[model samples]
Target: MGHSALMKGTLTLKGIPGGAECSVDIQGNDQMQFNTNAITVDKSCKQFTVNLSHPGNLPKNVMGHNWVLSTAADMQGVVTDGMASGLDKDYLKPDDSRVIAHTKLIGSGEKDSVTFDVSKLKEGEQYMFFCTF
Candidate 1:
């Protein structure tokens, strides 16, 4: 740590690009990855939306993807149960309470969106945004 050092350390900042204040856009590829790893929500929003798209050339059975939201602690449990639910169920258990919000499974050139009440979330809680497939 430097208080009054002659030379200051360099710092850089990075952030997600443009999106409506109440919504975010996410992309998935054939490689099984989402375009963004983190999302920061503003407290001003009453409802938040997640728009998911798959731009790869793979089909649903091969490289399907979906946007899933849950608490960090519930992520593993949700994912574990989702594996048994199959693609028809979007790889998620039907009416899963652990899922805060989720988009339907999508393949190449397909898209899905989900919107949820921001009031359901609490400040300072660690939430996870991930793909189950």
Candidate 2:
């Protein structure tokens, strides 16, 4: 007599796992576009980091890229004000509280990273990530 064998079913997983740890990579090209349109921060992380990479060969003044983070409500204001702030200030107003985190502007073949406390993020509040050049 043979013993009955237990059949296991395939498990399909969707979305980020609970307490999941991961990284988001963003690439900027010479065309002044970010490879990523949006980013999601896992609520479980104690801190989150954004890594920006410029793979072209242009100078910052000609083609620069920076990663900026702010609340969805503040994004428009930040962008408008940032454009006036100029490249010397990384296209952002100095000491702008609306900005939660940002990386220094980088030129082609350059890279930058910014890390911020996850606690600053609220569960229901919406956040935005974008590049300014």
Candidate 3:
């Protein structure tokens, strides 16, 4: 096989093409914390995916969490505006250009994921992930 699978967050990956990983998983809770603070997307992947799971016992209204991805330079602006968009919008501005990808808000055993073309990422550029928690 030309591909290999690696599990860094206790989440399984299937049919990985080789080197690093093509997807990730993180758990969120009422503590407003994520299971993982850092992620390393393999440059080898032409596309990437993120999985967000909330294992808590609350509703999205009270403790919602959404995984948002954007360039480091754009994250601040996205977060600032997202704060006003309300939870109904998952704390993200509608079709905001700064967003690279995001998942819907979830809570209490809920799970969601997002996949995006890796070409959006530029070489030598920095990317970041944050929660609307």
Best-performing candidate as measured by lDDT:
1
TM-score of each: 0.84, 0.83, 0.83
User: Model 3: residues >4 Å from true position, as ranges?
Assistant: 1-18
Q: How do all the candidates rank in terms of TM-score, highest first? A: 1, 2, 3
Candidate 3 TM-score to native: 0.83
Worst 10 residues of 3 by lDDT: 1-10
Q: Mind sharing the TM-score for model 1?
A: 0.84
For model 1, the superposed segments whose C-alpha errors exceed 4 Å read 1-20
Give per-residue CA lDDT, model 3, range 1-133, as digits (tens): 0000111121222333567668887777876677776676766788888888988688888777788877777777777788778778877899999888888988788999899887787766767777744
lDDT of 2 by residue, 33-105 (tens): 6765657667677777778898978888887778887787787777778878887998888898998888898
Model 3's alpha-carbon lDDT is 0.71
Per-prediction CA RMSD (Å) = 11.1, 15.0, 8.9
Cα deviation of 85 in candidate 2 (Å)? 1.1
Off by over 4 Å in 2: 1-15
> Lowest summed-lDDT stretch of 10 residues in model 2?
1-10
How good is model 2 by TM-score? Answer: 0.83
Model 1: per-residue lDDT, tens digit, 10-123? Answer: 111123254238787888887776766768766667788888898969988788788887887787777878877877887899999999888898889999999988887877
